[PDB]
Amino acid sequence: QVQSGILPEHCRAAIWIEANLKGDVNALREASKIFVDNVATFQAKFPDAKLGAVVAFGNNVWRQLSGGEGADELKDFPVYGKGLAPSTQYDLLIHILSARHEVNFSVAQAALAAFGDAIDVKEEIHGFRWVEERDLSGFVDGTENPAGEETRREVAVIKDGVDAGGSYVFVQRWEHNLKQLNRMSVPDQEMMIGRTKDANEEIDGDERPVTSHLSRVDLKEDGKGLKIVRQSLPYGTASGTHGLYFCAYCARLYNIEQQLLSMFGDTDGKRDAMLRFTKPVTGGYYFAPSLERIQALG
Amino acid sequence: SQVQSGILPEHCRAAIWIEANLKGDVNALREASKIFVDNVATFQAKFPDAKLGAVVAFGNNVWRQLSGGEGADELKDFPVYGKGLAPSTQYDLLIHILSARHEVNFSVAQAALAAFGDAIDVKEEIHGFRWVEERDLSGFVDGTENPAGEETRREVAVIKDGVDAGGSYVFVQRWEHNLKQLNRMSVPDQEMMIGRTKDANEEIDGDERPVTSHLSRVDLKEDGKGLKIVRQSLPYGTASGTHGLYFCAYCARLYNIEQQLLSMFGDTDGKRDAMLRFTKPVTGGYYFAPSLERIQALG
Numbered sequence: 001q002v003q004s005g006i007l008p009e010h011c012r013a014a015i016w017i018e019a020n021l022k023g024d025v026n027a028l029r030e031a032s033k034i035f036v037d038n039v040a041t042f043q044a045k046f047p048d049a050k051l052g053a054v055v056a057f058g059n060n061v062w063r064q065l066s067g068g069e070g071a072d073e074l075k076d077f078p079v080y081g082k083g084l085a086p087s088t089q090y091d092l093l094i095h096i097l098s099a100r101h102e103v104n105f106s107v108a109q110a111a112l113a114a115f116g117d118a119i120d121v122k123e124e125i126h127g128f129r130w131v132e133e134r135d136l137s138g139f140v141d142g143t144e145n146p147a148g149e150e151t152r153r154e155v156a157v158i159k160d161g162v163d164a165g166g167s168y169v170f171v172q173r174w175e176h177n178l179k180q181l182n183r184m185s186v187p188d189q190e191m192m193i194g195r196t197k198d199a200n201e202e203i204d205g206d207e208r209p210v211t212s213h214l215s216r217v218d219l220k221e222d223g224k225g226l227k228i229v230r231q232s233l234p235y236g237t238a239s240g241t242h243g244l245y246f247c248a249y250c251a252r253l254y255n256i257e258q259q260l261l262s263m264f265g266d267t268d269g270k271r272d273a274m275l276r277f278t279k280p281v282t283g284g285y286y287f288a289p290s291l292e293r294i295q296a297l298g
Numbered sequence: 299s300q301v302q303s304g305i306l307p308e309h310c311r312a313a314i315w316i317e318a319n320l321k322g323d324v325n326a327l328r329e330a331s332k333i334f335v336d337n338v339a340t341f342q343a344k345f346p347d348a349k350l351g352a353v354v355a356f357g358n359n360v361w362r363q364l365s366g367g368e369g370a371d372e373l374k375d376f377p378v379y380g381k382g383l384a385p386s387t388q389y390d391l392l393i394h395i396l397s398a399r400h401e402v403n404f405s406v407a408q409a410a411l412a413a414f415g416d417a418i419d420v421k422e423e424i425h426g427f428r429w430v431e432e433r434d435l436s437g438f439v440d441g442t443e444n445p446a447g448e449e450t451r452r453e454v455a456v457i458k459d460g461v462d463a464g465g466s467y468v469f470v471q472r473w474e475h476n477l478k479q480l481n482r483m484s485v486p487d488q489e490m491m492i493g494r495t496k497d498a499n500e501e502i503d504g505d506e507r508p509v510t511s512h513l514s515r516v517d518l519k520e521d522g523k524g525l526k527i528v529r530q531s532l533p534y535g536t537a538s539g540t541h542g543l544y545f546c547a548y549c550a551r552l553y554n555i556e557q558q559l560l561s562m563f564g565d566t567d568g569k570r571d572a573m574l575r576f577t578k579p580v581t582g583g584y585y586f587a588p589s590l591e592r593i594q595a596l597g
């Protein structure tokens with residue numbers, strides 16, 4: 001019932017396509033059914049890839065496709081920090097992940113053939129897992145990410161009601177300035193993140209700044225963690241733009257939004273220390289329906 | 299007398315090509331090149347699993363300066379072919395990194411940029427990937443008649459004696475495929491354009507295919523001796539944006555490459571390559587890849 005791209009772990013490569021609807025919204029119903037069938041065909045042809053994919057929709061388009069039923073938290077991605085986090089809300093998100101970039105490329109081509117000229121592609125990002133599963137900053141990223149199908153489903157997948165099997169998606173492309181990062185001593189970079197760089201040990205919450213990344217995003221509400229399932233990957237060229245393509249799934253949009261309000265100064269007026277070397281340049285929220293919901297579109 | 303590690307490896311799934319111009323004094327390339335080939339050895343020791351190789355190669359103007367004009371007799375700036383059908387974008391430096399792991403290539407590319415620093419102006423950076431069934435994005439298999447095995451690849455690509463022993467000439471040319479235009483062609487018309495069958499990859503006989511077919515343009519012989527080259531090309535791009543083939547070839551003589559270009563672009567017999575119907579070259583450059591010892595001896 002869940003779309004195949006939400007739960008797989010340790011993907012080596014991904015493709016994210018963000019697009020606007022040019023045509024009639026009804027064009028998305030047949031295209032989405034064709035695409036999920038193409039995904040099943042590619043999984044049968046390349047079982048070693050561990051391929052998964054997700055089709056997700058922006059607020060305006062999803063309200064039309066669903067007739068206003070469910071997806072109660074869905075809204076256009078707002079700016080956070082009064083503009084520190086910009087907003088680039090589009091209508092459609094396609095997320096393709098697997099162990100093989102070449103298979104993702106064929107799947108991306110099938111997605112574009114299915115949607116055709118009904119969409120205007122705004123962004124296409126090719127993610128790759130880097131050496132030692134580190135972010136391009138040199139810090140390991142995924143250590144506290146929910147692990148195993150059971151916990152990932154608990155965090156990411158809606159349990160009951162009309163949206164059972166669905167998930168909320170957040171995508172945000174960051175552009176790293178590695179020259180500005182390298183000007184920082186390793187201990188200063190470690191206090192900025194909240195984990196040691198080489199050994200990847202958590203720095204105690206009482207011993208690191210409240211602006212450290214972990215202090216901004218490891219949030220609890222009366223001891224219950226506001227967890228999310230991250231599928232982010234590094235991207236870019238060595239000589240041009242590079243950074244992290246942030247991607248997260250959650251059964252509630254609330255958990256993601258509380259982390260953004262914290263990181264961008266809206267909650268307590270303090271900003272994530274990572275803003276010293278990297279910045280977000282896109283931002284969008286989407287609703288990922290269940291596979292049964294996609295089949296019930298036409 | 300040792301060949302640079304990136305020329306001969308076969309079947310590497312990923313590559314990075316960086317093309318750049320020199321901003322200041324040519325001297326800056328001397329230490330940077332030594333640092334970079336040392337970084338390559340360090341990365342091979344750290345990621346023995348990667349099967350990493352790399353090449354540093356130089357354009358005519360900068361190689362004449364670094365070599366004092368000795369050797370590399372065929373080197374010259376890449377000219378236009380077909381009076382402009384093949385454009386020319388000759389730069390000063392080419393860095394080619396290939397391995398079984400794109401992530402390792404990325405670290406090596408960053409080390410190359412750290413070594414050369416602000417002495418260079420990067421003009422192009424292309425990330426190549428091997429596609430499904432080793433096919434070009436056009437859907438045709440690549441590589442079938444490419445020299446195979448170290449022995450033949452060395453014979454074709456590596457200079458055997460003299461001051462340039464262990465070196466090679468490099469040609470790079472980025473093509474932009476129009477897959478929509480290709481898909482308007484029937485499969486039999488695409489097969490006559492290439493000179494091989496599409497699904498089974500069987501050669502169409504030379505007397506049964508047009509003289510404009512790709513194989514008829516580039517499978518050239520001089521009294522029965524093939525003008526062979528070692529190709530290291532890979533597909534590149536985005537599905538929604540620009541994509542195609544990043545053509546890359548190594549040869550012990552620049553002559554073999556040039557005869558194929560004169561043929562493909564209409565200079566030899568007035569006929570051009572049928573692939574121009576759906577794809578076009580947008581860059582072009584020739585470089586000289588010295589042997590590892592000649593790079594170590596830069597100073």
Ligand code: HEM
Binds near residue numbers: 135139143244246
């Ligand atoms: C430049 C952008 C970012 C970088 C480089 C980055 C990097 C990291 C690193 C290195 C970790 C620690 C390793 C781990 O446990 O996964 C981490 C953890 C985390 N990040 Fe980020 N991050 C970024 C943006 C974001 C954003 C935008 C969010 C949420 C909206 C976020 C949410 C999280 C969460 C929830 C954790 C786990 C915290 C915990 O429970 O320990 N990150 N990030």
Ligand code: HEM
Binds near residue numbers: 434
């Ligand atoms: C869009 C650009 C190109 C495409 C799609 C392309 C495609 C192909 C294909 C499908 C083959 C047949 C399989 C094989 O034997 O490898 C081939 C062969 C070959 N291509 Fe290309 N090619 C391109 C450009 C070039 C260029 C620029 C050159 C040389 C300057 C070249 C030289 C060769 C050679 C020597 C062969 C082997 C011919 C033989 O001996 O049978 N190609 N190419």
Ligand SMILES: [C-]#N
Binds near residue numbers: 141230246
């Ligand atoms: C954080 N990723």
Ligand SMILES: [C-]#N
Binds near residue numbers: 440441529531
């Ligand atoms: C030709 N490759």
Ligand SMILES: [Mg+2]
Binds near residue numbers: 144218
């Ligand atoms: Mg924690």
Ligand SMILES: [Mg+2]
Binds near residue numbers: 443517
């Ligand atoms: Mg032949």
